[PDB]
């Protein structure tokens, strides 16, 4: 019963390989933002963590996620960098 058409679904910040290539520790919030644009979400609980998630769900043929996480210091200086090309397991 997967015959019904489904509109393409997108939920990302459009991470491009060049843009993730420009990443290098030691920038400030403004510098990294100019590199990538404003993140569409950040951790609101206790810490300033920037999440750049790049999702794509075309048709009935699975999903595609490029995940990137950045943690800075209380003075807004880049401290830790993380990236996942795919989604753990399924």
């Amino acid at each position: 019963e997967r015959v019904v058409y489904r509109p393409d679904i997108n939920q990302g910040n459009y991470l491009t390989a060049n843009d993730v290539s420009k990443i290098r520790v030691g920038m400030t919030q403004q510098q990294v933002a100019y590199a990538l644009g404003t993140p569409l979400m950040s951790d609101p609980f206790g810490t300033n963590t920037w999440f750049y998630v790049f999702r794509q769900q075309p048709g009935h043929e699975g999903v595609t996620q490029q995940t990137l996480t950045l943690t800075f210091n209380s003075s807004g200086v880049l401290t830790n960098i993380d990236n996942k090309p795919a989604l753990s397991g399924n």
């Binding site: 939920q11 569409l40 609101p44 609980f45 999702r55 995940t67």
Partner: protein
Amino acid sequence: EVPDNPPNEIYATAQQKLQDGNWRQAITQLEALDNRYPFGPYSQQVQLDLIYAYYKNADLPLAQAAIDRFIRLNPTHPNIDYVMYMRGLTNMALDDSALQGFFGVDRSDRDPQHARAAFSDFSKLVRGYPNSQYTTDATKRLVFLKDRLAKYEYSVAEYYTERGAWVAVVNRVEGMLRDYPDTQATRDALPLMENAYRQMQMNAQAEKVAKIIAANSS
């Protein structure tokens, strides 16, 4: 039509027709004498009567026009709290259809632009004039408006859960938390947030929101 009569008897008949309850000819004579003598000492009381008349007959756009005019001409009238309260009341009651309340469907996800403006007006009243005759009613109505806005926000977030756009639902529940961290809607919507974080396997914050939910379970 209406003869040019002294303001005495025209205002007297205004008062007694208004006391009668007939409102068509009441507003008619009020607007007539308002146009005719926009200098008399009646003007303050004339306009304060006319705003009540427009409200009672449900001519709300004209009531809003007249109430803006009144606020403009004397911004510091000694008894402006009443007219501000009427502003809020008209603005809120303009958000009713009188048919979806017959059938019992709750209008908590329709266009919430009049609710917001009514909230702003009531909040302004309670800020400026916390010692007037319209405090407790304003507080009750304002609580009602806050809950209605929360309900609408939860409605949008819930739909985006059904669709499966988890960034959007994350942002919406975050806005809930920042703006209405006091209502029941956010308490119900936190599970949607945890589901969202678990969906993109950003579970590291999923356990955080899990504690958020669990702490105030009771």
